[PDB]
């Protein structure tokens, strides 16, 4: 995702004998992250039926 | 801009064989400063259109 950032700057001398000079602005990136996972488990079968509950 | 400085001074010992001197008064200056500035700023155009805002 992207960003512009502020502007920032002197005034100037108000002055005659010479000109201004206009400015500029910028830009900027950002970015993130994708995470997958799982897990997983088991039993057996004779030791349920052996063992009183399951 | 000018101003007016107050008035001081001894009394005197009011007495006989001798007479008294007034005093004066006197005058002060004072200035100040004018000061001016400015800037400017700027852009492409084909940016602009192509970037997806303004």
Request: hydrophobic share 60%; charged share 10%.
């Given at each position: 995702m992207p960003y512009w950032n502020d502007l920032d700057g002197d005034?100037?001398?108000l002055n005659d004998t010479d000109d201004l000079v206009p400015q500029k602005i910028n830009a900027g990136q950002d970015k993130a992250?994708?995470?997958?996972?799982g897990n997983a488990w088991s039993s057996h079968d004779l030791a349920a039926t052996l063992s009183g509950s399951d």
């Open positions: 005034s100037q001398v992250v994708l995470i997958l996972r």
